[PDB]
Design a protein around this ligand. Structure first.
Ligand SMILES: [Ca+2]
Length: 300
């Protein structure tokens, strides 16, 4: 059966988890030089000093790391991937990986989208945050959402990851409460992310992103097909990859559709390229495929 290259969503991490990998690995070093030129700054140095978990600098560095690990894994393990897919942030990585964007343009886009989101969320949708959690069966989830409904609290399911694994976007006045409620029913809160992602309510952000960051870029046809993360559709053109990146703002990630599409495409093995402890480990993926988890730790 076929091998697919997969790019994870971006979780929070410390510079400390990857710094040594970044400056020592041959593949990261080449992409960093290209990144620094594009950006006009030393990414490693800015990332080291950065605030929070999702700075512009941490996002570009995650880009660098995932694409580096994909190349490293192909070469060192003689993978000849036939198809690829990215989840959430990983759409940006797969855009680079598939050559739908030059690596420089992918860095430009990633930086631009980071700044665009930062500016948007500093004057719009104030207080919105995205929560990731596991061991939350959907019926238990639905109970929590029905309690939010009773109090008129806005929310959207931003990611469907597994049967019991989701990301929920809502107002931060409900964050601590949600964490408690999840723990009440045996679920496990993982992390709270800002900027938030994937929500019908983010149409004005999609527009701004389109105008300021994405419209100016030249997309190229991918060198291999790309399975969209909104719905599992197989994509073969630059335009489709562009559309995917913009749809990402307003449609949820549906990882089960990505996995079942890949099964339908005759995939039996996947490599998950990047610092990840979610996408390479979740049952949705492992129940379907043999997984290679190409992490900084494996590469070292
Ligand atoms: Ca209320």
């Amino acid at each position: 059966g076929a091998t697919a290259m997969l790019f994870p969503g971006m979780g929070p991490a410390a510079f400390s988890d990857v710094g040594r990998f970044m400056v020592t690995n041959r593949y990261t070093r080449e992409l960093l030089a290209e990144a620094d030129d594009t950006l006009g700054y030393s990414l490693v140095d800015r990332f080291r000093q950065a605030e929070g978990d999702y700075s512009e600098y941490a996002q570009i560095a995650f880009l660098v790391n995932c694409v580096a690990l994909a190349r490293w894994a192909e070469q060192t393990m003689d993978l000849t991937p036939r198809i690829c897919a990215g989840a959430s942030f990983g759409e940006k990585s797969v855009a680079a990986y598939s050559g739908a964007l030059t690596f420089a343009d992918a860095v430009r886009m990633t930086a631009g989208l980071a700044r665009c989101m930062d500016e948007y969320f500093r004057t719009e949708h104030l207080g919105v945050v995205t929560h990731s959690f596991v061991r939350a069966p959907r019926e238990r989830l639905d109970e929590i959402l029905a309690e939010l409904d009773e109090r008129g609290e806005w929310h959207e399911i931003s990611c469907h990851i597994d049967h019991d694994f989701f990301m929920l976007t809502l107002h931060e006045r409900n964050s601590v409460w949600l964490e408690g409620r999840l723990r009440s029913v045996g679920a496990m809160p993982l992390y709270a992310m800002r900027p938030p992602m994937h929500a019908a309510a983010f149409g004005g952000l999609r527009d701004k992103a389109e105008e300021e960051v994405i419209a100016p870029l030249t997309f190229h046809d991918p060198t291999l097909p790309v399975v969209a993360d909104q719905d599992g559709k197989v994509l073969t053109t630059g335009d489709e990859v562009r559309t995917m990146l913009l749809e990402s703002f307003v449609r949820p990630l549906r990882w089960p559709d990505v996995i079942s599409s890949l099964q339908d495409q005759g995939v039996t093995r996947v490599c998950v390229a990047g610092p990840d402890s979610l996408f390479g480990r979740v049952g949705t993926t492992t129940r379907a495929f043999e997984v290679i988890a190409a992490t900084p730790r494996l590469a070292l």
